[PDB]
Design a protein around this ligand. Structure first.
Ligand SMILES: O=C(O)CCC(=O)C(=O)O
Ligand SMILES: [Mn+2]
Ligand SMILES: [Zn+2]
Length: 302
């Protein structure tokens, strides 16, 4: 399913150990949560839960008990610290090992302009609007002033003709996705204000880059970062960041310094896109609705 990119080898025969997909700490599943469910099938000799991973490893005393878990727990639902439902998927593993990845680069074509606006400029926009969502496109002069500067500065190359307002509350976010190709051009920028947050960007092949969007920052995503990748916001109330560069934006790597968590706040976003007139024709037909419009096969795959 995903374990492929994760470097986890699975076998088709019963074994004492098995990987538990979606049963990891990085998914919101606690040891006090999973361990009980696991023991319900046998004597759990070990529950290995690697940090920041959407999975954990379980090992039973006998290979028979393990098979019981594989056939009874597979598909079982559990509630994370986010008060959400998540199904578990177990698989037999001969050995317990996985790959650790630490992206050093933002998805190509993505860039976060820090302190794009001032404090008063932030306060203003916030008190001039009134999961909460709001569409446009049209564009209120309230920002026609800013956009103009955006272009001159060079941060943006095209003036948008549509804008969406998103207001997220501590806990709520938005599931991963990719803005429609045939709907907007190759340039979608997003101004985050009120309270910093962490946007997740994922590549189909497997790469996972958790980008931290600070307040008063303009996330501009173009190219691959806007056509192939996928942006989302894990619904949580606490984001983990690096001690020093906590307020700074970028990739939140680990093992390079002491780590500390931060509480979320009422974040409001202003996404700007230019509605496309022609049909999209990028280099990513795997996700481009326009380029795969007339393909019975793709159609079947919905
Ligand atoms: O939260 C953001 O800044 C991204 C906006 C977004 O995902 C959308 O509404 O299409
Ligand atoms: Mn979006
Ligand atoms: Zn496309």
């Amino acid at each position: 399913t995903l374990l492929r990119h994760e470097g986890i080898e699975t076998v088709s025969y019963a074994t004492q150990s098995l990987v538990v997909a979606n049963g990891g700490l990085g998914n919101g599943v606690s040891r006090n949560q999973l361990l009980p469910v696991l023991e319900k099938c046998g004597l759990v000799d070990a529950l290995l839960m690697p940090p920041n991973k959407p999975y954990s490893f379980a090992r039973y005393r006998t290979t028979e008990e393990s098979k019981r878990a594989y056939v009874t727990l597979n598909g079982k639902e559990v509630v994370d610290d986010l008060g959400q439902k998540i199904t578990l998927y177990l698989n037999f593993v001969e050995k317990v090992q996985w790959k650790e990845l630490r992206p050093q680069a933002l998805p190509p074509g993505l860039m976060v302009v820090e302190e794009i606006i001032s404090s008063e400029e932030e306060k203003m926009l916030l008190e001039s609007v009134d999961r909460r969502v709001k569409h446009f496109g049209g564009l209120p002069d309230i920002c026609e002033s800013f956009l103009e500067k955006w272009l001159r500065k060079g941060y943006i190359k095209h003036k948008p003709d549509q804008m969406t307002i998103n207001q997220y509350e501590p806990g709520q976010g938005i599931p991963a996705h990719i803005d429609t190709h045939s709907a907007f051009e190759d340039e979608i920028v997003s101004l985050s204000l009120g309270s910093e947050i962490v946007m997740d960007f994922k590549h189909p092949d497997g790469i996972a880059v958790p980008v931290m969007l600070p307040r008063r920052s303009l996330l501009v995503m173009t190219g691959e970062s806007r056509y192939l990748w996928t942006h989302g916001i894990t619904c949580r109330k606490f984001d983990t960041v690096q001690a020093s560069e906590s307020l700074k934006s970028g990739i939140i790597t680990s093992d390079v310094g002491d780590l500390t968590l931060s509480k979320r706040g009422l974040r409001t976003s202003f996404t700007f896109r230019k509605v496309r007139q022609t049909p999209c024709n990028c280099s990513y037909p795997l996700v481009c609705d326009s380029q795969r419009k007339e393909n019975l096969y793709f159609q079947g795959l919905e």
